[PDB]
RNA sequence: GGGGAACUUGAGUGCAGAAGAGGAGAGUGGAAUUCCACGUGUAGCGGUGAAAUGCGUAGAGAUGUGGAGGAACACCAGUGGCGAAGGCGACUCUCUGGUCUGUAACUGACGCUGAGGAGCGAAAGCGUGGGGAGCGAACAGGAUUAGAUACCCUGGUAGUCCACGCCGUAAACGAUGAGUGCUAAGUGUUAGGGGGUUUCCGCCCCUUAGUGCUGCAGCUAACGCAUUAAGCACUCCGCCUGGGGAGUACGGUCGCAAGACUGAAACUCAAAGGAAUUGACGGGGGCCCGCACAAGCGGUGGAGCAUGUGGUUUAAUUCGAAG
């Protein structure tokens, strides 16, 4: 066995910012192609309308808000199944936070997908959202069991 | 490896001589073992006899 | 109340912390159970570390600066709390490894696997 | 074999040293555990894989003092030493046993073994009188479990200790009886003695007696033992003759008792066993692998239907397949 990894959804190499990185590539982890690259790219403009600024900035601001920095896994010891706090790798951070946004977007429930997702992006740009809610529950769980190393 | 008593050629302890007993007990009051004092096996038992006698006589502490 | 002595027991289940005066007069104390650890978690070094700074906080407001610590029994809390003291801003002048070591004492309890 | 006269190597005595938890009696001392009173002292302490019983606001635990007691003597401590064996470790003293070394002054075979007999003989156990800190059968409570009369936790009676008697057993083992002589070495270590350089230290060579570790020949069925023989030999004693039945039954001798020693049989089986060999397996160890597990996706069973199987059903529901 051994470590393994890959990269994809790559934007262009040079003169590339994160905003156009996503405006041409990235994320889209909702299903097959189509119904993504669509039901998206339009979520951003509705929040260009809903906020008087660049609709991208709120995206990674809400992302920063959702990012955890500790979490906890399960280990078998004696007969207790202690919950052991651990850290998060730089890529594990992004994948899991993005995952939380997408799954809660498809859980919350309103008229339709793109307004659902946009409302959560702003509810995570502000620090009152469902995904952020799970973020602080994982966090309080973790440093409530900080003792276990 | 160096054997202090046979090196300096001295006979039995003469327990009153409390000066070298400090050197042969640790600062904690623990009596040092052969592995560190390097003294001869026959003399070590009469050593611990002498230290025990003087310890009872309160010339060396039981614990420091 | 400038100088004192901090005593900590390092057991396999708990770690108590208590401070006293050179005249052997207590001021304040703390413990893993005092803080809220109930199970085996009391034995963790973290619990003793927490105990250390609550003891320090109960110490400062009475105005004691210099300490020297006596540790009793073997346990994981040996290293945690002692450096937690200086992490709490205090100054511990000596470390004393005083534990009851009987020459023969009393016959210990039976074995754990019979 | 008997008798007489020698002799000294065997066996002892004397002489000079050496060592030792060798034994019995008296006293003495240090760290602790517990309890008690006292100061300070807030909220839990204790405990296990988690927990719980327990102890605490009637102030615990913790922490600083002072007492009270009973048990064992930390490091020194070492496959070290002593003892015939059980066993024997703090210190001092009183009494007392045995051993080794060098001698050559003494006696001159005074030696070995030993059925019965006698005495010792760990721990538990018993009797009398004390003592009782801790530990702790029994016993209670709390856990675990389907159950748990246990493993775990909190208590805790008898015992554990002392004086005098009794029992006479242990895997009382080196699972190897005692004594004597001979048979390659190497290597530690304990108590000595002699010598070569110094009567300095410490360097080495011989040398007895122990006490380990490797290793020839030899023995061994294999392991392995191998000058501390399980080798080569001689004396004396004890013990064995297939496994159960059974160290039980009966009868005796002991014991207050528990029980101990002596110790059949009928019946029944063709095996029971020792050591080594190869696989298997372990809630054994050391490595390594696999969508094996983690880390993700989407599913199965909840509904309807398609199909296969079990059951039932028939006249037949053709037979085969069954982790």
UniProtKB/TrEMBL annotation, chain A:
Please list the GO terms describing molecular function: rRNA binding; structural constituent of ribosome; tRNA binding
Write down the superkingdom of origin. Bacteria
Pfam families in UniProt = Ribosomal_S7
Q: Which CDD domains match?
A: uS7_Bacteria (cd14869)
**Keyword rRNA-binding in annotation:** yes
Database matches in PROSITE patterns: RIBOSOMAL_S7
GO BP terms: translation
CC per GO annotation: small ribosomal subunit
User: Can the keyword Chaperone be found in this entry's annotation?
Assistant: no
- Report domain Small ribosomal subunit protein uS7 positions: 1-146
Protein keywords: Ribonucleoprotein, Ribosomal protein, RNA-binding, rRNA-binding, tRNA-binding
Question: Which positions carry the signal peptide feature in this UniProt record?
Answer: none
Give the family this protein belongs to, as stated in its UniProt record: Belongs to the universal ribosomal protein uS7 family.
| Subunit and partners | Part of the 30S ribosomal subunit. Contacts proteins S9 and S11.
Function of this protein? One of the primary rRNA binding proteins, it binds directly to 16S rRNA where it nucleates assembly of the head domain of the 30S subunit. Is located at the subunit interface close to the decoding center, probably blocks exit of the E-site tRNA.
Name by which UniProt lists this protein = Small ribosomal subunit protein uS7
Classification of source organism: Bacteria, Bacillati, Bacillota, Bacilli, Bacillales
- Point out the gene that encodes the protein: rpsG
Automatic annotation (TrEMBL), chain B:
Q: Which gene encodes it?
A: rpsR
| Name the UniProt record assigns to this protein | Small ribosomal subunit protein bS18
Q: Which UniProt keywords apply?
A: Ribonucleoprotein, Ribosomal protein, RNA-binding, rRNA-binding
Specify the species.
Bacillus subtilis
Annotated family: Belongs to the bacterial ribosomal protein bS18 family.
* GO biological process terms on file: translation
Q: What does this protein do?
A: Binds as a heterodimer with protein bS6 to the central domain of the 16S rRNA, where it helps stabilize the platform of the 30S subunit.
How does it associate, per the subunit comment?
Answer: Part of the 30S ribosomal subunit. Forms a tight heterodimer with protein bS6.
Coiled coil (UniProt feature):
none
* One term of GO molecular function: small ribosomal subunit rRNA binding
GO CC entries: cytosolic small ribosomal subunit
Keyword Transmembrane helix assigned to the entry: answer is: no
């Amino acid at each position: 066995k051994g470590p393994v990894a890959k990269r994809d959804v790559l934007p262009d190499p040079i003169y590339n910012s994160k905003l156009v990185s996503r405006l041409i590539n990235k994320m889209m982890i909702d299903g097959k192609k189509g119904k993504s690259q669509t039901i998206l790219y339009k979520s951003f403009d509705i929040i260009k309308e809903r906020t008087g600024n660049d609709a991208m900035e709120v995206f990674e601001q809400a992302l920063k808000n959702i990012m955890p920095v500790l979490e906890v896994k399960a280990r078998r010891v004696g007969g207790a199944n202690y919950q052991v706090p651990v850290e998060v790798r730089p890529e594990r951070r992004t994948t899991l936070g993005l995952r939380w946004l997408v799954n809660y977007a498809r859980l919350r429930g309103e008229k339709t997908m793109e307004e659902r997702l946009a409302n959560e992006i702003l509810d995570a740009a502000n620090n009152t959202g469902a995904a952020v809610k799970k973020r602080e529950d994982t966090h309080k769980m973790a440093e409530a069991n900080k003792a276990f190393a | 490896k160096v054997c202090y008593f046979t090196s300096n050629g001295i006979t039995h302890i003469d327990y009153k001589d409390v000066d070298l007993l400090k050197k042969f007990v640790s600062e904690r009051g623990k009596i040092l073992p052969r592995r560190v004092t390097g003294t001869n096996a026959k003399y070590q038992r009469k050593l611990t006899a002498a230290i025990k006698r003087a310890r009872q006589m309160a010339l060396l502490p039981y614990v420091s | 109340i400038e100088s004192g002595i901090a005593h900590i027991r390092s057991t396999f289940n708990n770690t108590i912390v208590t401070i006293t005066d050179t005249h052997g007069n207590a001021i304040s104390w703390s413990s893993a159970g005092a803080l809220g650890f109930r199970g085996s978690r009391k034995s963790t070094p973290f619990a003793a570390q927490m105990a250390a700074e609550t003891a320090a906080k109960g110490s400062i407001e009475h105005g004691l600066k210099t300490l020297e610590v006596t540790v009793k029994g073997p346990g994981s809390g040996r290293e945690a709390a002692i450096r937690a003291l200086q992490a709490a801003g205090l100054e511990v002048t000596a470390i004393r490894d005083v534990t009851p070591v009987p020459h023969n004492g009393c016959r210990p309890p039976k074995r754990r696997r019979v």
